[PDB]
Amino acid sequence: RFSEMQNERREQAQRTVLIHCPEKNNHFFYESFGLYAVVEFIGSLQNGNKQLFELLCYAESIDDQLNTLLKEFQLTEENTKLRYLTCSLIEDMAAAYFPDCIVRPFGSSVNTFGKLGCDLDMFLDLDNLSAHKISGLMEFQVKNVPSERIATQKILSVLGECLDHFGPGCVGVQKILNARCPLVRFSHQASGFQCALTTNNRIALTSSELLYIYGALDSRVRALVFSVRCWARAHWITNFSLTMMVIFFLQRRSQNTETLELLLKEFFEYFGNXXXXXXXXXXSQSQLQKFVDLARESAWILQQEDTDSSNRPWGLVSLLL
Amino acid sequence: RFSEMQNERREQAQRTVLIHCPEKNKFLKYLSQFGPINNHFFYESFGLYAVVEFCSIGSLQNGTHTXXXXXXXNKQLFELLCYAESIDDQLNTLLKEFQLTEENTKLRYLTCSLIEDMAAAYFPDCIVRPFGSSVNTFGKLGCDLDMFLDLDSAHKISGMEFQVKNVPSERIATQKILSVLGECLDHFGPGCVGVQKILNARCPLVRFSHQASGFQCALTTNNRIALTSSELLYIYGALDSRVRALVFSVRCWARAHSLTSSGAWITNFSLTMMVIFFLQRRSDSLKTLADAESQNTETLELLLKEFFEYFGNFXXXXXXXXXXSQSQLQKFVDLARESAWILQQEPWGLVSLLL
């Protein structure tokens, strides 16, 4: 149901078209520098933040708080289908050199812990060149592949070069072919997405299927991470570290009627006692402390909360200050 | 009949495939299994290759994994002229031995197709056609294959007009285009080695080398002027046998002495001109030819001799030469005046002049 979901979404973009305009199936358009229109049916045409804080104090429980913070931050169908199209425009540019190739989004854009206004990560799947120029047992004629890493750095370098000079929207391009997982980041003007592309690593689509299955395995999972992160930001250790500990904290429990209010509070209580590879299995001292500090403090606030409410700091909002 | 010829030749390479092989009819018996097969031919750059042209071709691509006559593509020429039976049979041998051969001609039209393939990724309906010394009729074997990429698009539209990167000057557009193509040839483009960008010359170009064929290639983008220079001469070389025969030999003559070289001298194109010139100032102007589209029995022997005699005094121009080193031009006439004498008297004929 994940591999499946992506394909209905990808096929979706293929019939979608992004149109720029002045200022005047289902159709939906958005804003940025002008008014852009997303339209889906072909070659038939070509041929011719803080306000959130204050909005929580009007909810009628801590549990209704997490659920608002999640609603306001999580991606929206529009946006979701808009970064799938972006992937499609790219996949178009890369399908010139590499015919049947797929660029599909991954990470925070596809699991369920995607926040609005984040990075669109893209993974270019290739399953080199195929010309008239053959070689003989007939076999296509390619440029000898020393390591599959260089082949990455190359590929990315050319796509990179193409995006930059002739490829609409694509700006702020920059190559980073030397970082363990070589990548190329640019920016698409028509959408405001910080995007990044990589080539050889089916590991990210496998990291993003996990969380997918967790975020959709139970409502509260999405609710709890979205708030811990937000808590965490409000005050190193990576957004992925936390998330883990949270799916973790969720297993080391256990049907389970617990409330977000209770669950949240038990989050901090539980962690009262570098690497996302050292202190947590691959699925700064001063820092981790200040985390438990926060953890232990963010505990007591909710302790009073229950032990001992209006439109001045309460429940969650007390924890985002 | 030029624009025309180029298209049949291009369509021709489209159905042509270039195969690399070890070193051994079982072989056509093979390829035959993907459809007929017009002609075909061998040749060997730094290995042995097959150039096969089918009668489509997608099916062969669907067939992959993960005692033979080679069709040839200098000094011995000197000695071979001394066995011809007249000075006129000399110019016509020197011309046959040096001029391009169907094989080669169709081999550099295929190379253009493999390139055109790499640039039709970015620019769909683009054509890369060869030009210059590879297309007129004055092309000598083993010369430069010059190519011209003619350009006449995403979902991402703008309002209904496509969305492009703003074109500052059409010269930068060129420089950019050539840079990407250039980047692509170098890294992932089979055979294409020794690549090098030259984007600052007045005609920006990118030169490389194709291993599979030994061609020194060169690509440029915006200039229909070369396809217009090359049609002129075309019509000249084909307008009368002797033209081809005469230039091929004055060039050779030229090269033989420290004259026409591969800097600041006098270019193989200069000469050629003077010769088409020399040929009109006898008993067809590029005017009554450019805008529009007489017998003369002279022999090559006579013609050639009168070439040097005519440039014995050559305060006058010659429509430097109009576009249709002092010490050097002199040593030219020196040679001109001497290379006359020799034919005046009684190694022989031409070969006397190539020494």
UniProtKB/Swiss-Prot annotation, chain A:
GO biological process: histone mRNA catabolic process; mitochondrial RNA 3'-end processing; mRNA processing; RNA 3'-end processing
GO MF annotations in UniProt: ATP binding; identical protein binding; magnesium ion binding; manganese ion binding; poly(A) RNA polymerase activity; protein homodimerization activity; RNA binding; UTP binding
Name this protein carries in UniProt: Poly(A) RNA polymerase, mitochondrial
A GO cellular component entry from the record: mitochondrion
Tissue occurrence: Ubiquitous, with stronger expression in tissues with high energy requirements: heart, brain, and skeletal muscle.
Gene symbol of the encoding locus: MTPAP
Binding site for Mg(2+): D119, D121
Family: Belongs to the DNA polymerase type-B-like family.
Keyword annotations from UniProtKB, A to Z: Acetylation, ATP-binding, Cytoplasm, Disease variant, Magnesium, Manganese, Metal-binding, Mitochondrion, mRNA processing, Neurodegeneration, Nucleotide-binding, Nucleotidyltransferase, RNA-binding, Transcription, Transferase, Transit peptide
Predominant subcellular localization, coarse grouping: cytoplasm
Assigned EC number: 2.7.7.19
Keyword Ligase part of the UniProt annotation: no
Disease: Spastic ataxia 4, autosomal recessive: A slowly progressive neurodegenerative disease characterized by cerebellar ataxia, spastic paraparesis, dysarthria, and optic atrophy.
Subcellular location: Cytoplasm; Mitochondrion
UniProt: ATP binding residues: Y30, E31, S32, G117, C118
Quaternary organization: Homodimer.
Chemical reaction(s) catalysed: RNA(n) + ATP = RNA(n)-3'-adenine ribonucleotide + diphosphate
Cofactor(s) the record lists: Mg(2+); Mn(2+)
Biological role stated in the UniProt entry: Polymerase that creates the 3' poly(A) tail of mitochondrial transcripts. Can use all four nucleotides, but has higher activity with ATP and UTP (in vitro). Plays a role in replication-dependent histone mRNA degradation. May be involved in the terminal uridylation of mature histone mRNAs before their degradation is initiated. Might be responsible for the creation of some UAA stop codons which are not encoded in mtDNA.
